[PDB]
Amino acid sequence: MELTPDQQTLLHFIMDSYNKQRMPQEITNKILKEAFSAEENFLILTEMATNHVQVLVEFTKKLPGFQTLDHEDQIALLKGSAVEAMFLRSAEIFNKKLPSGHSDLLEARIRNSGISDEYITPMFSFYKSIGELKMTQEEYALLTAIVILSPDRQYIKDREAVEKLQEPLLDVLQKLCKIHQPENPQHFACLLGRLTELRTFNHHHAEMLMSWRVNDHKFTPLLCEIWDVQ
């Protein structure tokens, strides 16, 4: 029922590493400060996404046991989860409580950032489905680690080794749900169900990026490796 000593250590250790991220307010303060052109926004996106990949590799390297995995599998995990982690992190920031009308403005700014309307609806549909879950910081942190340690990723050779690493995180997450919402004995499964919608963002991420309303689509060397663009 309650969190054991080993689980309390895992959680706090996950929280510490998750906390090495660019503070949310910085990203939203900037978007809300003024309106930018589709060109300025594509550049804000590439800079933010390059820093996020770098932070994700450091977060991933700290996940208990990740280092012991076969090197090629380590690559397949990072590569397979980077786009999802980025959208889950964007979902987290989108649903953070803001002063009155600020979230309306944040949504308006993003909707008009340069992304094609084709991709706007699926994106806000996912961020909205996330906001309905009223996730805590510990939940976003655990869900991110669960996403990274997905044993059914493509080109994963040794799936069992990854299952062994993902299971303790699912266990801690499940215990937390059975506590933070005893009122919703579905919360754990609801959180897990969202991972299916997250996966849909892999399919058209490249299309979504190349469709941005700019005349040139310049990425960084790191983003080219991880996104399959250029």
Binding site: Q54, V57, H71, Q74, E225
Partner: peptide, 11 residues
Amino acid sequence: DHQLLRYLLDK
């Protein structure tokens, strides 16, 4: 190739 990613992972 994932040269950059392999680099960041090993360092």
